[model samples]
Target chain A: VDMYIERAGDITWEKDAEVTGNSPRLDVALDESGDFSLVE
Target chain B: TTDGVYRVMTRSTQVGVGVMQEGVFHTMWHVTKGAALRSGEGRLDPYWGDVKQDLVSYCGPWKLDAAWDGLSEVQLLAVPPGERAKNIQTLPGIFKTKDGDIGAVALDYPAGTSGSPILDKCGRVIGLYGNGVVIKNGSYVSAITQGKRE
Candidate 1:
């Protein structure tokens, strides 16, 4: 499913689930133990 | 070190956040107590108060020293189960992190994504929790209101 994020102080929810601007991406890596690595 | 889910390989799709208390590592997630000894993320179905069952299903007594970070208005990151686990996709929301609390919640729909690191502005953990259907204004997150957290 498409993902989205909603925070406090927002005037309204998004029209579609996705936001309306440039959304930055974080490259994450998870290990077997459920850890994270921001590699790439 | 702050983006992961807690489960015994489990879900309604609940998730977890790892925290350090008194120099110990423990997984503290919110659950509604349909029940087990596991912590989790809340969506309001098991509204915060509802999930605030008799006990907090937190786990472990660790030896790691850590605490929450300095709060500030920040962009919130929502990690879907597929995106987070496989390292594929990500999105940001306007969280406007608060100082007095230690949690932030985002609006989105991704099963098994109840607990993931809601990223801060400078890229540290701010805080945001989840439920089946997470919405703004309706959902909220924060530190334990009152308790001997040590």
Candidate 2:
């Protein structure tokens, strides 16, 4: 039905920023556990 | 305290019958997606005019569809017309608890009772009311308007 992400501090986020998926929400390359961009 | 009956509403504003147990107000999935749970007032109608939406703000907004594993054959307490149900207000229901199977119950419930819990005497929920379906008997009730919960 309805899905939502928790909102906290105002942060800049992107939707469908260079990704594709079956779901319309958003698709992204999620880092395992890093500072957004991975060194590996 | 006695586990009582109440009304459930979704963030999208879908009303249905409700039951509380183990800190969770259990009901059907179609009525969730996030919803409201009202209590203490009076009446069996899920769409009671007195109980406002903001009053049922006790439960969390986070919701999910639990593991469904039912659908046998049972009788449960039905809150017809939005009032607390008695043993005499029982309904003959088809317990369809397995995944992908919609459960059905036969009853004469009031308006907006689609998400009502079909519970037993010992306060055991068997199925959740959905909508109305006329097979051959008379009036049957939804996931397809009713669902069996776990």
Candidate 3:
């Protein structure tokens, strides 16, 4: 799965962040209500 | 799409047959970990689901010859509705569909027969014979394979 990050300005991000639980690739998107949600 | 790995979930044993990729055989614990959350005492258990890994023992990897290099839009064929049989040697006859993007062809295979490979004319594995999605047309029986591409 491929992911794209939409940022307001130039920013730096690390791909090696550690997280817990099973990681199923999900697409994140911003809603019209100013909240983040997973794109199904 | 064709390069993607495929496996089946057995009913008698949750851990079904799978061809390990890149010469790495995964343990049962390694495959079922975090697959599903556990529940006990009317509450969610802290640990993962109690998968029946003991039902089948994990053996060493068994290598086989390569099939197709990758998935491509190819014509698929299936047994006709009337002529379908419970025990048959092979399903012959090619039929064209508008949706050639399908990676696998579902068949009227038994439930316990999950993990059986769906092969093409040349005996190359095209898809895994398991329950996933059901085809709508009455000409095709109920059997679906996991789609490699959306």
Model 3, residue pairs in steric clash: B2-B71
- Best candidate according to TM-score: 2
Candidate 1, residue B85: Cα displacement in angstroms equals 5.1
- On residues B1-150, what C-alpha lDDT tens digit does candidate 3 reach at each position? 012122323222333222222332211222233232111122111121113211111222322232332332211222222222122223222212233222233245333334333443353434433323323342222122322210
Q: Candidate 2: lDDT over CA atoms?
A: 0.35
Per-residue error for B146 in candidate 1, Å, reads 11
Q: Candidates 2 and 3: which is better by TM-score?
A: 2
lDDT of 2 by residue, B8-91 (tens): 543333355555443444444444333333333421222211121111212333122332234323344444443554332322
Once model 2 is optimally superposed onto the true structure by TM-score, how far is the C-alpha of residue B150 displaced, in angstroms?
Answer: 9.3
Question: Which candidate leads the pack in DockQ?
Answer: 1
Going through the candidates in order, what is the number of backbone clashes in each?
15, 23, 1
- Model 1 residue runs over 4 Å out of place are A1-40, B1-8, B11-50, B53-77, B85-106, B121-124, B131-148
Candidate 3 positional error at B10, Å:
8.1
Interface RMSD, candidate 2? 22.0
**After superposition, which runs of candidate 2 have C-alpha atoms over 4 Å from their true positions?**
A1-40, B9-14, B36-73, B88-103, B120-122, B136-138, B142-150
